Design a protein around this ligand. Structure first.
Ligand code: MCM
Ligand code: K
Ligand code: K
Ligand code: ZN
Lengths: 4, 365
């Protein structure tokens, strides 16, 4: 999971 | 059947302005379009809200029910919220379920207009939230309206082509149709480790049966209108001849445009417009969607310009908007100038990707  | 449909209502715009990541952007977009009076050249259709059943054609009930759970109050203490994608990128605000339902319904409505044949082009600039998974909020997207729209179009059209020109990889839409050949996804995006969402390499071509029915074009920072269109035209030419779509869904996130705080690509609305024109000349039922865009004025500039392209009209250079006029300073013109930033896309790497893609599209028949 990444951050945008 | 020749006049584009423009999904709009004051209630809809008010709802879309409430997204914490792009406040008042929907108003700015409509206001600029309204000032050019382009909405007079379009059939304005009020958006319906998506029902629970309609939303459940993609999203799981467990996710949708958790959405309306935290939405009726603004609860940010639910332990399961983080596993449902809620958090920093997608805050558990109040009325966020009505927000999602509104945006989801607006894209379905646009798809319904295409089916009924009241238009060849249906516009929803407040949609294109392509990151959302079936049971997970992601990248400012709580609900995948793009997917809900493609599903609705499949009631009438056998093969749907999805083109994603957003800065980010349209992973949510790709994953939704990763297993099928009835819908092909094409995404042009920035690909670099650490950069959201982290997927969409050129080697990602789908799974099992949707294999080679997913196309990804990894691009680096600094690309401009000229080269971008050449890459896009190349892919779309091969894609069209191979896939032969009956309808098109086009995502046009303006976070590629120069001046965006994300500062990756170096595009102007003109370059995106050429991509639009190439798609429009296919004369297919086309669902136009928005997406990213974090320079609000430039995003308004881009999508107003693109609306002008769809209408075949040339817009005056001077910004005629009065309500948000100051936001277009200091020069107050529609046109946008790219930055003095190097293009980190070497012509040989691009050539490799185009060869790889062409090799993949040969299996599509
Ligand atoms: N993913 C992402 C990146 C940057 C952000 C800023 C600067 C503000 C914000 O509220 O959310 C962001 C999310
Ligand atoms: K994209
Ligand atoms: K696919
Ligand atoms: Zn984006």
């Amino acid at each position: 999971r990444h951050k945008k | 059947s020749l006049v584009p449909v423009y999904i709009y209502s004051p209630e809809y715009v008010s709802m879309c302005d409430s997204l914490a990541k792009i406040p008042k952007r929907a108003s700015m977009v409509h206001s600029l379009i309204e000032a050019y009076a382009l909405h007079k050249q379009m059939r304005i259709v009020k958006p319906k809200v998506a029902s629970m059943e309609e939303m459940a054609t993609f999203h799981t009930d467990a996710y949708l029910q958790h959405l309306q759970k935290v939405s009726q109050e603004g609860d940010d203490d639910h332990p399961d919220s983080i596993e449902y994608g809620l958090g920093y990128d997608c805050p558990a605000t109040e009325g966020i379920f009505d927000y999602a339902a509104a945006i989801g319904g607006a894209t379905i409505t646009a798809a319904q207009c295409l089916i009924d044949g009241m238009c060849k082009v249906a516009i929803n600039w407040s949609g294109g939230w392509h990151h959302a998974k079936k049971d997970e909020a992601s990248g400012f997207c709580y609900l995948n309206d793009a997917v809900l729209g493609i599903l609705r179009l499949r009631r009438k059209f056998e093969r749907i082509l999805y083109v994603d020109l957003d800065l980010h990889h349209g992973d949510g839409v790709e994953d939704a149709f990763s297993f099928t050949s009835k819908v092909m996804t094409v995404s042009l995006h920035k690909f670099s480790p650490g950069f959201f969402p982290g997927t969409g390499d050129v080697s990602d071509v789908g799974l099992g049966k949707g294999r080679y029915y997913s196309v990804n074009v990894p691009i680096q920072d600094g690309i401009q209108d000229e080269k971008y269109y050449q890459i896009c035209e190349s892919v779309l030419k091969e894609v069209y001849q191979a896939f032969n779509p009956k309808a098109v869904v086009l995502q046009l996130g303006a976070d590629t445009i120069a001046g965006d705080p994300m500062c990756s690509f170096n595009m102007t609305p003109v370059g995106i417009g050429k991509c639009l024109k190439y798609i429009l000349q296919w004369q297919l039922a086309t669902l136009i969607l928005g997406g990213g865009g974090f320079n609000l004025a430039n995003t308004a500039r881009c999508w107003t310009y693109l609306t002008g392209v769809i209408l075949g009209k040339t817009l005056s250079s001077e910004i005629p908007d009065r309500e948000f006029f100051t936001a277009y300073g200091p020069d107050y013109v529609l046109e946008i100038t790219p930055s003095c930033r190097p293009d980190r896309n070497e012509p040989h790497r691009i050539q490799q990707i185009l060869n790889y893609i062409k090799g993949n599209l040969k299996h599509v028949v």
